[PDB]
Amino acid sequence: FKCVNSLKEDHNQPLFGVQFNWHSKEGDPLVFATVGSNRVTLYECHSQGEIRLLQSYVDADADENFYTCAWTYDSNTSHPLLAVAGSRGIIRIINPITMQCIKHYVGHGNAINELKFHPRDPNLLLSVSKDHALRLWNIQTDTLVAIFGGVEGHRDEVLSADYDLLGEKIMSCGMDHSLKLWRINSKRMMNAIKESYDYNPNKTNRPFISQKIHFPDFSTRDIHRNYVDCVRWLGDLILSKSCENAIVCWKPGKMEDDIDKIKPSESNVTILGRFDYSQCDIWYMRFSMDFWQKMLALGNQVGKLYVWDLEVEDPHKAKCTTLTHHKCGAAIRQTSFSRDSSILIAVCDDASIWRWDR
Numbered sequence: 001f002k003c004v005n006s007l008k009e010d011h012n013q014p015l016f017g018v019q020f021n022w023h024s025k026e027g028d029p030l031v032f033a034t035v036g037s038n039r040v041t042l043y044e045c046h047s048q049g050e051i052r053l054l055q056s057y058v059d060a061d062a063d064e065n066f067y068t069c070a071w072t073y074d075s076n077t078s079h080p081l082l083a084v085a086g087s088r089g090i091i092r093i094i095n096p097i098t099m100q101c102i103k104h105y106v107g108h109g110n111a112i113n114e115l116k117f118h119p120r121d122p123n124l125l126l127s128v129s130k131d132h133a134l135r136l137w138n139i140q141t142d143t144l145v146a147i148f149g150g151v152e153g154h155r156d157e158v159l160s161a162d163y164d165l166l167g168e169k170i171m172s173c174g175m176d177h178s179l180k181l182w183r184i185n186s187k188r189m190m191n192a193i194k195e196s197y198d199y200n201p202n203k204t205n206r207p208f209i210s211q212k213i214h215f216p217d218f219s220t221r222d223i224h225r226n227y228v229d230c231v232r233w234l235g236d237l238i239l240s241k242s243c244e245n246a247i248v249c250w251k252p253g254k255m256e257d258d259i260d261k262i263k264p265s266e267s268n269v270t271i272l273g274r275f276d277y278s279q280c281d282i283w284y285m286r287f288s289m290d291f292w293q294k295m296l297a298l299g300n301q302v303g304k305l306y307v308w309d310l311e312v313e314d315p316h317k318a319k320c321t322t323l324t325h326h327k328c329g330a331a332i333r334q335t336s337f338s339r340d341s342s343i344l345i346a347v348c349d350d351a352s353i354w355r356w357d358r
């Protein structure tokens, strides 16, 4: 990777998120979104490092702070869609072409810290909240499918979550120091998703009933000793981090325990490796992976990028490379690889955007 360009957004506030559109069409340029202040902005990547500014959506409320965004597509038309959310607790579905807000959703109106789309169903949107719950939405029928919470759920803000390969289960994490597993391939959840697709409020008298899921299928506080602010599945293993200068690779149970035989009372974890780094001991710093999960990237609080090659036989054999530029000194809150991993974008606390090309 070589640094080919940078720019700064005019609001001068932190950029909390960046995401390439991995649903961009053949023959079209690569596009990424950034979120920070009360806006979302799209850019196209062009030759000679050019980062071409397109158009923003700016919230009507000057005090909105978008924290997260995620791409999907319309299941009938194929056109890409961009979901954004943050401090107001409003999920907006944005038409990226025109930057129109197509529609919006509200749970209880508390801040949303992360959005993720299901890996196999473009309509299933997971939101994680300041109010300690996760919410699963069906954005085809505009229904709240399920709320994951209760006293055995998270006990402080939920900061991140991730679906596994096939979207059979979710791992969530947050300020309570815990990581929690929630299976969504149970008979109950499969039925709830089916019912969400069969719901049309114009053809019935009933409201749509959301599931209350009050018991995780696994929970641990044994991985980290502070806020857990990013989680991703790596097959049946988990990668997670806190503010302790480490990404830990671990699994529920003992070494030979199958993830799908793990019971809710399981008290053990197994540590398969740990990727250490420096100067990333502030809260709220995200790592990202490429589409194929060959690579992992994390920025630190003084503008250094760490990239790990995971194309090795075991997690602890990951190969690290580092990327620095003398003008890049602000905290990097999130990174995003293009789908082919030819481009890596980093976004920062000073509203700067950094492009690295392979």
Ligand SMILES: COc1ccccc1CN1C[C@H](c2cn(C)c3ccccc23)[C@@H](N(C)C)C1
Pocket (backbone or CB within 6 Å): 014, 016, 017, 067, 113, 157, 159, 160, 229, 230, 283, 284, 285, 286, 333, 334
């Ligand atoms: C990059 O954001 C990440 C990264 C990992 C997990 C979650 C988030 C989203 N955050 C949005 C919030 C935030 C507000 N202000 C003013 C900030 C200034 C700096 C950083 C973060 C914030 C945080 N809540 C809990 C207060 C969580």
